[PDB]
Design a protein that fits this description.
Belongs to the terpene synthase family. Tpsb subfamily. One of its GO terms (biological process) is diterpenoid biosynthetic process. Residues 1-176 form the Terpene synthase N-terminal domain. This protein is mainly alpha-helical. Helix content is 70%, strand content 0%. The protein binds ligand FPS. Ligand FPS is lined by residues 249-250, 253-254, 257, 270-271, 274, 277-278, 281, 285, 382-383, 387, 425, 482, 485.
Length: 512
């Protein structure tokens, strides 16, 4: 996975035929019919959840929303009322699909005195699991869902080792590591294909479609990786001391942000930006002198490369690649979207290098920022304002200066995502140490505080998605999915990473 000879040859061929593609068109039609067609409502919720978890929401979003809307406007509730598993699955799938369900659907499962969940639930594994997964769709002040999380976490930890079904035990272990709401879609799809195949409820048409679609999508990723590896070797940044494997790390993160084939060009551009972010992060952290870094920053602020030959080669090359790629991406927006994006790529790079320079000056002067002071800068230095403003530039319908100026100002929805990506990275001049310095907290207490900030910012993202937004798809999804990418990659670590890379990007799923 780390060999550019091997990567640069990916895309050359694929074992995905026109026969595979026709078969895929036929299976898609039956799955679409299964989602729209008759089924008992609990079975339909479980089917739609399986479609999502197999990575296929992008193929059936309209059918799934229509089916859930039907179910939501029912009037007949006997199928779910008094059933924890049914109540919790309904609550989750409706909230995920923009249909509001109040937290009070769970009040009947509580002790009316203490507000604690009933002891009699402690044995219901599938109920606890659905309640756990449901809890992460909660908003600020939804106290029943905060209790549901703490209760279902404690109970699932308790019962995990008591489960008889191996498949169910693996699912519970997976959930305790990360809830489904926090998992990167493409990576979870590869994991869940093998789990689903072993489920007793398993639908073989849906399994077969999931394997075939997985392989077809993966052939697009392999062509992208080819083009990106050839680009990267073209830049000569593969040969620089630092950011060993930056390209493939960037691309693997990009796949968490957006995996769909129709977003290939956008994904390649995000991946280039990410490769440069990680490369230049090393320049500012390890390699450059303060004078070199100040010049790098000043050149970028003025978007004026007159003085670039004052920098040494190993710094000039990253700078000019950043400049050239930013111009290319802004130009793509002009050619493809009618809107010159260079002012916006130049601006987010200037902002990011300013945030690196501030970190470098803090380090050099031995400054201890407050957690708030650190995060105000570190939500920029993490690179997600740069990555998200770029993704908006490339995907927004009818781009305008007004629209770009708004997204670039980092309203709550966007800022929440950036802060989350930063604090998740730090949990993986750092969040925990800053909070320790500010309050005298222990590492253990400081870590729990930062963890509570993750849960808080997630509740704000969740609520922002039920609110009318000036944003549309795919940007709404990008903002959530960069956070999932962060969770996934900040839980050998390199053996785990390579397996993820090999199973998701390199090896097709065996079809019979
Ligand atoms: C979504 C997408 C298109 C790609 C994202 C690309 C990447 C890799 C972005 C994350 C930024 C990182 C990991 C830089 C170091 S964080 P740090 O400086 O706090 O940590 P360090 O001290 O360098 O380990």
């Amino acid at each position: 996975l780390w060999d550019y000879d091997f990567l640069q040859s990916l895309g050359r061929h694929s074992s995905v035929t026109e026969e595979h593609v026709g078969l895929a068109e036929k299976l898609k039609g039956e799955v679409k019919s299964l989602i729209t067609g008759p089924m008992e409502p609990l079975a339909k919720l479980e089917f739609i959840d399986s479609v999502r978890r197999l990575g296929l929401k992008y193929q059936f979003e309209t059918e799934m929303k229509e089916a859930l809307a039907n179910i939501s406007k029912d009037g007949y509730d006997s199928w779910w009322v008094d059933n924890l598993r049914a109540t919790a699955l309904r609550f989750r799938l409706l909230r995920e699909n923009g249909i509001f369900v109040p937290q009070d659907v769970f009040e009947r499962f509580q002790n009316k005195e203490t507000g604690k969940f009933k002891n009699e639930l402690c044995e219901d594994v599938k109920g606890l699991l659905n309640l756990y997964e449901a809890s992460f769709l909660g908003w600020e002040g939804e106290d029943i869902l905060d209790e549901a999380r703490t209760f279902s976490t404690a109970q699932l930890k308790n019962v995990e080792g008591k489960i008889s079904s191996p498949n169910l035990a693996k699912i519970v272990h997976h959930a305790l590591d990360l809830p489904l709401h926090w998992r990167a879609i493409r990576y979870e799809a590869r994991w869940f294909i093998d789990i689903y195949e072993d489920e007793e409820d398993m639908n073989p048409t849906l399994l077969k479609y999931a394997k075939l679609d997985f392989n077809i999508v993966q052939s697009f990723h392999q062509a992208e990786i080819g083009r990106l590896a050839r680009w990267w070797v073209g830049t000569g940044l593969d040969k620089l001391p630092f950011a060993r494997n930056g390209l493939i790390q960037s691309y693997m993160y990009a796949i968490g942000m957006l995996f769909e084939p129709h977003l290939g060009e956008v994904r390649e551009m995000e991946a280039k930006v990410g490769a440069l972010i990680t490369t230049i992060d090393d320049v500012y952290d390890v390699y450059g002198t303060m004078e070199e870094l100040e010049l790098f920053t000043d050149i970028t602020e003025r978007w004026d490369i007159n003085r670039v030959d004052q920098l040494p080669r190993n710094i000039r090359m990253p700078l000019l690649t950043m400049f050239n790629t930013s111009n290319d991406i802004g130009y793509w927006a002009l050619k493809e979207r009618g809107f010159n994006g260079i002012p916006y790529t130049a601006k987010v790079w200037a902002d990011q290098l300013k945030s690196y320079t501030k970190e470098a000056k803090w380090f050099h002067e031995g400054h201890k920022p407050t957690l708030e002071e650190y995060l105000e800068n570190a939500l920029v230095s993490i690179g997600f304002p740069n990555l998200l403003v770029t993704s908006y530039l490339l995907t927004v319908d009818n781009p305008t200066k007004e629209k770009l100026d708004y997204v670039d100002s980092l309203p709550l929805f966007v800022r929440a995502s950036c802060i989350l990506c930063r604090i998740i990275n730090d949990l993986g001049l750092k969040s925990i140490q800053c909070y320790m310095n500010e309050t005298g907290a222990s590492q253990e207490v400081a870590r729990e505080h930062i963890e509570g900030l993750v849960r808080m910012w997630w509740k704000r993202l969740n609520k922002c998605l039920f609110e009318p937004s000036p944003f549309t798809e795919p940007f709404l999804s990008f903002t959530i999915n960069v956070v999932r990418g962060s969770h996934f990659f900040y839980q050998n670590a390199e053996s785990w990473t390579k397996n993820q890379g090999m199973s998701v990007l390199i090896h097709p799923i065996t079809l019979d």
